[PDB]
Amino acid sequence: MTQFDKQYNSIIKDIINNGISDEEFDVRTKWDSDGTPAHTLSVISKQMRFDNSEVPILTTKKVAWKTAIKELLWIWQLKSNDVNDLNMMGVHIWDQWKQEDGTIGHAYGFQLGKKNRSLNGEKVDQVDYLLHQLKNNPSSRRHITMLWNPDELDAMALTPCVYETQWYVKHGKLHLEVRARSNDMALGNPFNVFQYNVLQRMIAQVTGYELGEYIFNIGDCHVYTRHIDNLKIQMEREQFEAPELWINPEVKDFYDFTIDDFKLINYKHGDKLLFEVAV
Ligand SMILES: *C1=[C@](F)([C]N2[C]([C][N]C3=[C][C]=C(C(=O)[N][C]([C][C]C([O])=O)C([O])=O)[C]=[C]3)[C][N]C3=C2C(=O)[N]C([N])=N3)C(=O)[N]C(=O)N1[C]1[C][C]([O])[C]([C]OP([O])([O])=O)O1
């Protein structure tokens, strides 16, 4: 029925039938409740492609799309590592890793906000630089954002899962390729695939380019053991036509966007599904 649902279900099926278990190893993740080792079944190097003729969102279950966009704005627009700023918006998906100072360390927003790029005699951050270059230097083969700063990896509460993106301007179309080193297919993935396609749509609007291709790459593609049952259910559910994403046409500046500027139209989906989070 939809591009995302079809690709998503297939990858999940693959992991459940040919995934490799890590039950014999001392994994880093522990279950939220009992605190016991959280293991997974996994595969490596998986890719999802979208032509952008549809909005990449799952319909086999209820996706907290509003929360996804809020997190995106927290990282890319606000460029803050303050879990508190996020709580303000009513999101607590990052509360579990909040540090003593209320932040998640020198990660995510902190990296995108660092003024380490020389533009015109002044320093700008990765986001400002990318916005300028996409307009004044489309053909560049260096349109990259990097959350994986090797120098501050030790100062991050949790190293980024979706740590990089590369943009291509070809034929007046803006293409986006993002990569996740580690992807929790049940929880994070649905959030990641959607929130980044939204970022593509935002950047495209403020730069004046048509929508290009959208590619999502995954390194370690896994599914935690306790999620199998619900996913098996989710996969058998029916799917509905993808919804339409309305973005305020008025906004011309990237930093002018607000959660209210996004509206999902006709988003039909299955019932919500609970998935325990491994910390
Ligand atoms: C990684 C990342 F970053 C993500 N993540 C984070 C946080 N976030 C989140 C959480 C949770 C959630 C939920 O819960 N969801 C829900 C909703 C409802 C409301 O509204 O609230 C449903 O149901 O949907 C969401 C989100 C941090 N951490 C983590 C995460 C996830 O996801 N998972 C976990 N387990 N944790 C991204 O971006 N992505 C991804 O996927 N990731 C992951 C991968 C893995 O698994 C992890 C990490 O680890 P390492 O070992 O690899 O490092 O994560």
Briefly, what CATH class? Alpha Beta
N/C terminus separation: 33 Å
Radius of gyration: 19 Å
Bound molecules: a molecule of 2 linked components (UFP-C2F)
Tell me the strand order in the biggest sheet.
Answer: 1-2-8-7-6-5
Number of domains: 1
Structural class: alpha+beta
Largest sheet: 6 strands, mixed
H/E series, N to C?
HEEHHHEEHEEEHEHEE
Q: Helix coverage percent of residues?
A: 25-40%
Count every helix, treating DSSP H or I runs of 4 or more residues as helices.
7
The dominant shape is globular
Look up the CATH topology: Thymidylate Synthase, Chain A
List how many beta strands DSSP finds.
10
Organism: Bacillus subtilis (strain 168)
Binding site for dUMP: 141-142, 181-184, 192, 222-224
Keywords: Cytoplasm, Methyltransferase, Nucleotide biosynthesis, Transferase
Family: Belongs to the thymidylate synthase family. Bacterial-type ThyA subfamily.
